[PDB]
Design a protein around this motif. Structure first.
Motif, short mmCIF file in Angstrom:
data_model
loop_
_atom_site.label_atom_id
_atom_site.label_comp_id
_atom_site.label_asym_id
_atom_site.label_seq_id
_atom_site.Cartn_x
_atom_site.Cartn_y
_atom_site.Cartn_z
N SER A 184 0.85 -1.24 -0.04
CA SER A 184 -0.06 0.13 -0.04
C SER A 184 0.79 1.21 -0.12
O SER A 184 0.66 2.20 -0.65
N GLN A 185 1.85 1.44 0.84
CA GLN A 185 2.61 2.41 1.00
C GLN A 185 4.10 2.39 0.48
O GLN A 185 5.03 3.07 0.71
N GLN A 186 4.43 1.05 -0.12
CA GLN A 186 5.75 0.84 -0.48
C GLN A 186 6.84 0.94 0.43
O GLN A 186 7.59 1.85 0.41
N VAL A 187 6.53 0.17 1.74
CA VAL A 187 7.50 0.20 2.76
C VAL A 187 8.26 -1.14 3.08
O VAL A 187 7.36 -1.87 3.46
N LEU A 188 9.49 -1.10 3.01
CA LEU A 188 10.20 -2.57 3.32
C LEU A 188 10.92 -2.35 4.64
O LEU A 188 11.63 -1.40 5.02
N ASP A 189 10.25 -2.96 5.61
CA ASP A 189 10.84 -3.07 7.08
C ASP A 189 11.75 -4.16 7.33
O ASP A 189 11.39 -5.41 7.63
N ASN A 227 12.37 -6.70 -7.71
CA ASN A 227 10.99 -6.75 -7.08
C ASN A 227 10.41 -5.55 -6.86
O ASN A 227 9.13 -5.43 -6.66
N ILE A 228 11.25 -4.45 -6.36
CA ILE A 228 10.38 -3.30 -5.77
C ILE A 228 11.08 -2.15 -6.30
O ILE A 228 11.39 -1.14 -5.49
N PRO A 229 11.00 -1.79 -7.36
CA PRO A 229 11.60 -0.55 -8.17
C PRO A 229 11.02 0.78 -7.57
O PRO A 229 11.75 1.60 -7.20
N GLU A 230 9.58 0.58 -7.40
CA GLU A 230 8.98 1.97 -6.72
C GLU A 230 8.89 1.92 -5.12
O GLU A 230 8.21 2.42 -4.59
N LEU A 231 9.94 1.45 -4.71
CA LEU A 231 10.10 1.35 -3.07
C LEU A 231 10.35 2.87 -2.58
O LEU A 231 11.00 3.49 -3.42
N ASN A 281 13.23 6.01 -6.30
CA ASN A 281 12.15 6.84 -5.61
C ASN A 281 12.22 6.79 -4.11
O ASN A 281 11.14 7.45 -3.38
N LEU A 282 13.21 5.94 -3.44
CA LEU A 282 13.37 6.09 -2.07
C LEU A 282 13.29 7.45 -1.43
O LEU A 282 14.25 8.25 -1.93
N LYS A 283 12.49 7.80 -0.66
CA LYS A 283 12.33 8.79 0.06
C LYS A 283 12.72 9.19 1.56
O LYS A 283 13.12 10.21 2.16
N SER A 293 25.67 1.74 -1.31
CA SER A 293 25.88 2.96 -2.07
C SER A 293 25.42 2.87 -3.34
O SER A 293 25.14 3.96 -3.82
N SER A 294 24.98 1.60 -4.12
CA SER A 294 24.37 1.52 -5.22
C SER A 294 22.73 1.63 -5.10
O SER A 294 22.13 1.59 -6.12
N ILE A 295 22.65 1.71 -3.78
CA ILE A 295 20.95 2.09 -3.60
C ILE A 295 20.25 2.92 -4.42
O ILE A 295 19.30 3.23 -4.72
N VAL A 296 21.26 4.09 -4.62
CA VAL A 296 20.58 5.48 -5.26
C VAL A 296 20.25 5.19 -6.86
O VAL A 296 19.03 5.69 -6.82
N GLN A 297 20.68 3.97 -7.29
CA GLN A 297 20.28 3.74 -8.73
C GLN A 297 19.25 2.66 -8.75
O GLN A 297 18.53 2.28 -9.74
N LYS A 298 19.17 1.76 -7.52
CA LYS A 298 18.27 0.64 -7.37
C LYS A 298 16.98 0.91 -6.96
O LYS A 298 16.15 0.39 -7.33
N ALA A 299 17.10 2.00 -5.88
CA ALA A 299 15.89 2.57 -5.30
C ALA A 299 15.77 3.93 -5.61
O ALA A 299 15.89 4.84 -4.80
#
Length: 242
Positions: free
Chosen positions: A103-108, A143-147, A172-174, A164-170
């Motif tokens: 619902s909110q794209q939140v990975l815990d 699996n979760i590009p829109e995280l 929209n991470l806010k 540090s490669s999360i910048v390009q993997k995620a």
């Protein structure tokens, strides 16, 4: 130079029958050094480049009882018994799914190490380990590009370079939660500078005892994440431009 021979679905056949059928096709005599089963697949090494080639030529040539072909995958490799096993990944992958709120794209991934469902399965999820965070980020990208929000608190994390490669993997991470970890310096944040975070949590990290007041703290953090709006659960004063 060694080579590792993998036969997917090898445990589906008689070791005796299998090895014999391979040799019956392989142009040269060989010897399975270190043959072993690792879930459905059968694996063994080959200390020889010429052999490996002979073995690889046996691929797709052996028809099985139920009329399927037996495939042989060959890669060069290190030594005998010198990292994530497929099984660990599909497991890690599974756990991650159970903790993702669509619902909110939140990975815990909070305090992952102490988890029910893998209470001792013997795979101890160690996120502060390079190879593991690697696998984790890889799953997120697929699996979760829109995280949008990722929680990594309480995982003894200490070197953010690993993620540090999360910048390009995620993209929209806010929202990012790194509280309760083992970050020591402020410099660690520079490895994830590229994230356009709106929210961040760092409390619980010794790096905090580095500043004498919230003023300085916020400036340092905002220095890396300019559009930051919240920090440690508190709303921050609007950014003053120049």
């Amino acid at each position: 130079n060694w080579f590792k021979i993998t036969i997917p679905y090898g445990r589906k056949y008689d070791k005796a029958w299998l090895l014999s059928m391979i040799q019956s096709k392989c142009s040269v005599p060989f010897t399975p050094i270190e043959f072993h089963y690792e879930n459905t697949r059968a694996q063994f090494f080959v200390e020889d480049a010429s052999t490996a080639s002979a073995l690889k030529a046996v691929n797709y040539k052996i028809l099985d009882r139920e009329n399927r072909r037996i495939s042989i995958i060959i890669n060069s490799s290190a030594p005998p018994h010198t990292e994530l096993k497929p099984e660990q990944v599909e497991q890690l992958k599974l756990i991650m799914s159970k903790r993702y709120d669509g619902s909110q794209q939140v990975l815990d991934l909070k305090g992952l190490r102490s988890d029910p469902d893998l209470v001792a399965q013997n795979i101890d999820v160690v996120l502060n380990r390079r190879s593991c965070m690697a696998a984790t980020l890889r799953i997120i990208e697929e699996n979760i590009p829109e995280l949008l929000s990722l929680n990594l608190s309480n995982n003894r994390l200490y070197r953010l370079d690993d993620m540090s490669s999360i910048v390009q993997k995620a993209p929209n991470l806010k929202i990012l939660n790194l509280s309760g970890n083992e970050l020591k310096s402020e410099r660690e944040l520079d490895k994830i500078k590229g994230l356009k975070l709106e929210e961040l949590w760092l409390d619980g990290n010794s790096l905090c005892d580095t500043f004498r007041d919230q003023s300085t703290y916020i400036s340092a953090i905002r220095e890396r994440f300019p559009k930051l709006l919240r920090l440690d659960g508190h709303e921050l004063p609007p950014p003053i431009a120049f």
